[PDB]
């Protein structure tokens, strides 16, 4: 292995889910989806061990046609990330395509409380 | 909604299409596609309300195998965008995948004047 | 063509393959894949004519679930690329999607010496 660079990169826990019982999360998610049917509610939290800054607001109401890439730029600005700093999103531990819409990701991956959960990391 | 960040992001009008009649655009597009069959002609214009700079040249003749991402970097340089500034492309209001080729996008979306139309924005 | 910007962008040769015979490369690749089945061995080299810097280490042992995009950021750091500088990866002359995993790319494109070959360029 001496001639190789060994690259080192599931333990995600959303504090929103730790702090608030499922039934209360679902009551909120259902109210939002009924009132704003063209938008999707998203919880965005930092992955453990990520040395990147913590995001100030975790709850977003996003137009369904907004892409991952457009949302990346919004989140980058909120964290005040420098251009040289990396940011990756994970939905159920998988990085989505940058051109996927938030509506598509919500339809495919929202949990039964009607939220889409996104983790972010710098690696 | 107080605990949510409400994210706010079809009205695109290409001045190339406003200024030049369809028949003249098509005559030009057909001549280009006949003379340069391995290239695609592309019109690139800024979306309304985008506070980003206006692009100096709007007409591009692009190798069919060039990707969206390679073209992004070219356009970023022409606008003199800083690395922290965002740039998104839209074809018929949809952001294409970064690894799609311009030839694929042309085949799927060129208009009957034989041009591919790309709008760009900072959001 | 006067009103058009003519955009100008297969000749790739991996020095790893020039310097080391196939049988020796394969012996190494097979040993690595047996010992580290959840990782993939990757050779990363600069494309000809690319004015970008040369990469210091060419051999990487990568987790199979790491994405192209995560690997991009690693390679960008090793080259000391500024944020305004472009970097593109090519596997058999094709830029892969940023959300593809290295395991997927390896399964689809590894050569019979059990290495995945990636070229990089600034255009």
Numbering used by the authors:
A (entry chain A), B (entry chain A), C (entry chain A): -13 to -5, -1 to 112
From the paper:
Initiation of macroautophagy/autophagy is mediated by the ULK1 (unc-51 like autophagy activating kinase 1) protein kinase complex and the autophagy-specific class III phosphatidylinositol 3-kinase complex I (PtdIns3K-C1). Here, we show that PIK3C3, BECN1 and ATG14 contain functional LIR motifs and interact with the Atg8-family proteins with a preference for GABARAP and GABARAPL1.
The peptide array for PIK3C3 indicated two potential LIR motifs; a minimal motif of 11 residues with the sequence LDRLTFREIEM (LIR-F198) and a second minimal motif of 5 residues with the sequence FELVK (LIR-F250). This indicates that LIR-F250 of PIK3C3 is the functional LIR motif. We obtained high-resolution crystal structures of chimeric proteins consisting of GABARAP N-terminally fused to the LIR motifs of PIK3C3 and BECN1 with a Gly-Ser linker, and LIR peptides from BECN1 and ATG14 co-crystallized with GABARAPL1. The LIR-F250 of PIK3C3 (FELV) is a canonical F-type LIR motif with some stringent requirements for which substitutions were allowed in positions +2 and +3 and a requirement for D or E at position −1. The 2D peptide array of the PIK3C3 LIR showed that it is a canonical F-type (F at the aromatic HP1 position) LIR with some stringent requirements. The solved crystal structures indicated that the binding preference for the GABARAP subfamily can be explained by hydrophobic interactions between the residues C-terminal to the core LIR motif in position +4 to +6 and the hydrophobic pocket 2.
